[PDB]
PDB file of all heavy atoms in Angstrom:
ATOM      1  N   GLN L   9      -5.189   4.218   7.730  1.00 43.57           N
ATOM      2  CA  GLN L   9      -5.825   2.927   7.957  1.00 43.57           C
ATOM      3  C   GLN L   9      -5.354   2.272   9.255  1.00 43.57           C
ATOM      4  O   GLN L   9      -6.131   1.556   9.896  1.00 43.57           O
ATOM      5  CB  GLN L   9      -5.555   2.007   6.770  1.00 43.57           C
ATOM      6  CG  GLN L   9      -6.495   0.831   6.696  1.00 43.57           C
ATOM      7  CD  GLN L   9      -5.779  -0.493   6.790  1.00 43.57           C
ATOM      8  OE1 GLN L   9      -4.683  -0.659   6.254  1.00 43.57           O
ATOM      9  NE2 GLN L   9      -6.394  -1.447   7.479  1.00 43.57           N
ATOM     10  N   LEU L  71      27.890  -0.625  11.398  1.00 64.58           N
ATOM     11  CA  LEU L  71      27.827   0.022  10.076  1.00 64.58           C
ATOM     12  C   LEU L  71      26.536  -0.389   9.375  1.00 64.58           C
ATOM     13  O   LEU L  71      26.352  -1.580   9.072  1.00 64.58           O
ATOM     14  CB  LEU L  71      29.040  -0.341   9.228  1.00 64.58           C
ATOM     15  CG  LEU L  71      29.054   0.256   7.802  1.00 64.58           C
ATOM     16  CD1 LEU L  71      29.168   1.787   7.869  1.00 64.58           C
ATOM     17  CD2 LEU L  71      30.197  -0.331   6.997  1.00 64.58           C
ATOM     18  N   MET L  98      37.238   6.006  16.893  1.00 64.50           N
ATOM     19  CA  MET L  98      36.380   5.574  15.791  1.00 64.50           C
ATOM     20  C   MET L  98      36.102   6.707  14.813  1.00 64.50           C
ATOM     21  O   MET L  98      36.228   6.545  13.590  1.00 64.50           O
ATOM     22  CB  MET L  98      35.070   5.002  16.333  1.00 64.50           C
ATOM     23  CG  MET L  98      34.064   4.583  15.268  1.00 64.50           C
ATOM     24  SD  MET L  98      32.560   3.777  15.925  1.00 64.50           S
ATOM     25  CE  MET L  98      31.837   5.183  16.827  1.00 64.50           C
ATOM     26  N   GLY L 117      16.280  12.403  35.226  1.00 72.73           N
ATOM     27  CA  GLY L 117      17.114  12.420  36.429  1.00 72.73           C
ATOM     28  C   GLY L 117      18.285  11.451  36.482  1.00 72.73           C
ATOM     29  O   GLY L 117      18.881  11.292  37.543  1.00 72.73           O
ATOM     30  N   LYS L 120      22.490   9.633  30.785  1.00 75.26           N
ATOM     31  CA  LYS L 120      22.249   8.867  29.564  1.00 75.26           C
ATOM     32  C   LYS L 120      23.478   8.754  28.666  1.00 75.26           C
ATOM     33  O   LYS L 120      23.490   7.904  27.754  1.00 75.26           O
ATOM     34  CB  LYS L 120      21.117   9.514  28.764  1.00 75.26           C
ATOM     35  CG  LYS L 120      19.757   9.540  29.469  1.00 75.26           C
ATOM     36  CD  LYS L 120      19.236   8.131  29.707  1.00 75.26           C
ATOM     37  CE  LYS L 120      18.048   8.101  30.649  1.00 75.26           C
ATOM     38  NZ  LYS L 120      17.795   6.722  31.120  1.00 75.26           N
ATOM     39  N   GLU L 147      30.151  27.460  18.751  1.00 86.35           N
ATOM     40  CA  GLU L 147      28.891  26.869  19.189  1.00 86.35           C
ATOM     41  C   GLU L 147      27.770  27.804  18.760  1.00 86.35           C
ATOM     42  O   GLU L 147      27.854  29.012  19.005  1.00 86.35           O
ATOM     43  CB  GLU L 147      28.902  26.676  20.718  1.00 86.35           C
ATOM     44  CG  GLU L 147      27.662  26.092  21.320  1.00 86.35           C
ATOM     45  CD  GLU L 147      27.863  25.677  22.767  1.00 86.35           C
ATOM     46  OE1 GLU L 147      28.066  26.560  23.628  1.00 86.35           O
ATOM     47  OE2 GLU L 147      27.799  24.470  23.055  1.00 86.35           O
ATOM     48  N   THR L 154      21.504  22.537  18.727  1.00 77.35           N
ATOM     49  CA  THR L 154      22.773  23.252  18.780  1.00 77.35           C
ATOM     50  C   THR L 154      23.754  22.609  17.800  1.00 77.35           C
ATOM     51  O   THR L 154      23.796  21.378  17.700  1.00 77.35           O
ATOM     52  CB  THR L 154      23.315  23.190  20.206  1.00 77.35           C
ATOM     53  OG1 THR L 154      22.382  23.855  21.073  1.00 77.35           O
ATOM     54  CG2 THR L 154      24.709  23.771  20.341  1.00 77.35           C
ATOM     55  N   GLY L 220      16.868   3.525  19.132  1.00 72.60           N
ATOM     56  CA  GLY L 220      15.528   4.098  19.055  1.00 72.60           C
ATOM     57  C   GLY L 220      15.414   5.407  18.286  1.00 72.60           C
ATOM     58  O   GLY L 220      15.053   5.396  17.091  1.00 72.60           O
ATOM     59  N   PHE L 225      16.103   8.527  12.902  1.00 70.80           N
ATOM     60  CA  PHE L 225      16.869   9.455  12.063  1.00 70.80           C
ATOM     61  C   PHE L 225      17.287   8.809  10.732  1.00 70.80           C
ATOM     62  O   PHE L 225      17.064   9.386   9.652  1.00 70.80           O
ATOM     63  CB  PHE L 225      18.099   9.965  12.848  1.00 70.80           C
ATOM     64  CG  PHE L 225      18.936  11.001  12.114  1.00 70.80           C
ATOM     65  CD1 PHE L 225      18.639  12.357  12.213  1.00 70.80           C
ATOM     66  CD2 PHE L 225      20.040  10.624  11.360  1.00 70.80           C
ATOM     67  CE1 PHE L 225      19.405  13.299  11.524  1.00 70.80           C
ATOM     68  CE2 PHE L 225      20.809  11.570  10.672  1.00 70.80           C
ATOM     69  CZ  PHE L 225      20.469  12.918  10.760  1.00 70.80           C
ATOM     70  N   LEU L 267       7.563   4.066  15.695  1.00 73.72           N
ATOM     71  CA  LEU L 267       7.228   3.649  14.331  1.00 73.72           C
ATOM     72  C   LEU L 267       6.244   4.629  13.704  1.00 73.72           C
ATOM     73  O   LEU L 267       6.454   5.106  12.586  1.00 73.72           O
ATOM     74  CB  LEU L 267       6.665   2.219  14.326  1.00 73.72           C
ATOM     75  CG  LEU L 267       6.413   1.636  12.923  1.00 73.72           C
ATOM     76  CD1 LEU L 267       7.721   1.476  12.092  1.00 73.72           C
ATOM     77  CD2 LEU L 267       5.668   0.302  13.038  1.00 73.72           C
ATOM     78  N   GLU L 276       5.424  13.900   5.865  1.00 70.46           N
ATOM     79  CA  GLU L 276       5.519  15.356   5.841  1.00 70.46           C
ATOM     80  C   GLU L 276       6.773  15.818   5.112  1.00 70.46           C
ATOM     81  O   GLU L 276       6.754  16.845   4.419  1.00 70.46           O
ATOM     82  CB  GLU L 276       5.501  15.909   7.264  1.00 70.46           C
ATOM     83  CG  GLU L 276       5.384  17.427   7.340  1.00 70.46           C
ATOM     84  CD  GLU L 276       4.110  17.954   6.715  1.00 70.46           C
ATOM     85  OE1 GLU L 276       3.107  17.209   6.659  1.00 70.46           O
ATOM     86  OE2 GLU L 276       4.119  19.119   6.271  1.00 70.46           O
TER      87      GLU L 276
END
Side-chain angles (χ1 to χ4, degrees):
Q9 198 241 322
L71 178 66
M98 177 175 66
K120 297 296 168 194
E147 179 168 67
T154 298
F225 183 88
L267 186 64
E276 189 61 26

